[PDB]
Design a protein around this ligand. Structure first.
Ligand SMILES: C[C@@H](NC(=O)c1ccc(Cl)c(S(N)(=O)=O)c1)c1ccccc1O
Ligand SMILES: C[C@H](NC(=O)c1ccc(Cl)c(S(N)(=O)=O)c1)c1ccccc1O
Ligand SMILES: [Zn+2]
Length: 258
């Protein structure tokens, strides 16, 4: 009876196995755009993905991860609110059963159809497992998805999903370029938070882009054909794998833009 997103194992239950669920810097949050403060000291975000070496895509039973070789400084995030260099380890999404929900962060209570998380670890801690034990261990670049025109840079991901329909399936996924998932603008909001999935560790500097990307209804429909279950188990679609907004508590959200 492990954690998941259902009535009996979903977000309202997680605190029993992971008491930090009720902690002081939990994610996601609602981004109140009028309360967020413009911070002219914030730097432009530096996203240097030219040498990203994607390796594999995995259905882990909660979402799917596009994994990267993080054994060298090849795909790194710096600048913005960050001190030092953070290396890309994986990306994944959270999405809904319907276009009106799916994002984890919200903007003035608006829910997007999905949310992309590009997960990076601080190179001062040497790898991911050590980084997650530190309050400045991770930086996640969060990007909202709305349904409209297709995102051509997403299609290579969509087309491999048939091969990882079920939990524990992986496929080689090389030469994928995550630059094709970004939006024009790197304007962002930032705040200190946590993993949005168990173990919910309070180790993340969140960097949420203001500009969503557009994906087509056909693209998100293919996300919703995935399975939480492993092969030869009763079908439970892959949908609504999002944690709701958590209390902001004693935090300030800062904006990079006026
Ligand atoms: C579900 C999946 N989670 C991640 O891989 C994950 C890692 C880092 C971050 Cl920062 C995030 S997030 N959503 O905050 O961006 C999610 C998972 C797999 C295996 C064990 C535990 C576990 O949580
Ligand atoms: C639709 C997809 N297209 C691209 O990945 C793609 C091709 C050219 C370009 Cl320029 C881009 S872009 N501008 O989004 O970075 C993206 C695709 C291209 C070739 C084979 C399979 C595919 O799914
Ligand atoms: Zn996530």
């Amino acid at each position: 009876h492990h954690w998941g997103y259902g009535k009996h194992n979903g977000p309202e239950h997680w605190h029993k196995d992971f008491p930090i669920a009720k902690g002081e810097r939990q994610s996601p949050v609602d981004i109140d755009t009028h309360t967020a403060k413009y911070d002219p000291s914030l730097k432009p975000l530096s996203v240097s993905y030219d040498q990203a070496t994607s390796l594999r895509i995995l259905n882990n039973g909660h979402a799917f991860n596009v994994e990267f070789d993080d054994s060298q400084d090849k795909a790194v995030l710096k600048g913005g609110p960050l001190d030092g260099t953070y290396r890309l380890i994986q990306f994944h999404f959270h999405w809904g059963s319907l276009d009106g929900q799916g994002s984890e962060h919200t903007v003035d209570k608006k829910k997007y159809a999905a949310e992309l998380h590009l997960v990076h670890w601080n190179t001062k801690y040497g790898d991911f497992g050590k980084a997650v034990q530190q309050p400045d261990g991770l930086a996640v670049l969060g990007i909202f998805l709305k349904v409209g025109s297709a995102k051509p840079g997403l299609q290579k991901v969509v087309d491999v999903l048939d091969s990882i329909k079920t939990k524990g399936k992986s496929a080689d996924f090389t030469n994928f370029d995550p630059r094709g998932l970004l939006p024009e603008s790197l304007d962002y909001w930032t705040y200190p938070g946590s993993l949005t999935t168990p173990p919910l560790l309070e180790c993340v500097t969140w960097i949420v882009l203001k500009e969503p990307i557009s994906v087509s209804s056909e693209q998100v429909l293919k996300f919703r054909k995935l399975n939480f279950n492993g092969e030869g188990e009763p079908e439970e679609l892959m949908v609504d794998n999002w944690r709701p907004a958590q209390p902001l508590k004693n935090r300030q959200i800062k904006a990079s833009f006026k």
